[PDB]
Amino acid sequence: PVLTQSPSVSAAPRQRVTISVSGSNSNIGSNTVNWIQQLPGRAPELLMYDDDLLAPGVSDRFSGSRSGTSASLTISGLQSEDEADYYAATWDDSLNGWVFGGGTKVTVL
Template sequence: QSVLTQPPSVSAAPGQKVSISCSGGTSNIGSNYVSWYQHLPGTAPKLVIYDNNKRPSGIPDRFNASKSGSSATLDISGLQTGDEAEYYCGAWDISLTAGVFGGGTLVTVL
């Protein structure tokens, strides 16, 4: 059971948008920044969003994110087949004094 809760899967057609939710609590998302990672099988995870809504260099602006209270959302617009991957949210938890991840959401392009 992950500390952060994500839906197991989302899907949409090419060109459409998907939204992935991440629900936590006051000790993690509610009091710290949220980050998002893209993980393709057989590769290392890749940071796509940090500090709630900032994109690292090289991440397209099709990836956007927001945070409200103890929840966060990652939006991927203009969906491409290359976006098919598992996506994880992450945050620091001040009660655990450790980082935590969500359980992951599989994005499928129909």
């Protein structure tokens, strides 16, 4: 993964959590960021796109941001169904293709 995130975070329900990803100028510095969610045992699905837009059918509790070569995904009011792996994705103009992060696990306690 050319994008790096934090590895793992465990949290109580209804708490705010913020995952972040760091890139470079060739990718996040000049291209919008998408967020992908994978619940345990399920296929990955699109969570957010265009830095801060909700993918169809995604809950109001997710928000996104991008600045410089970094981006973030915030979950307000953590729910049990949010326990999952979260991956950042973006376009890299140098590599000229999709680059991803290694993923961040959020565990709801």
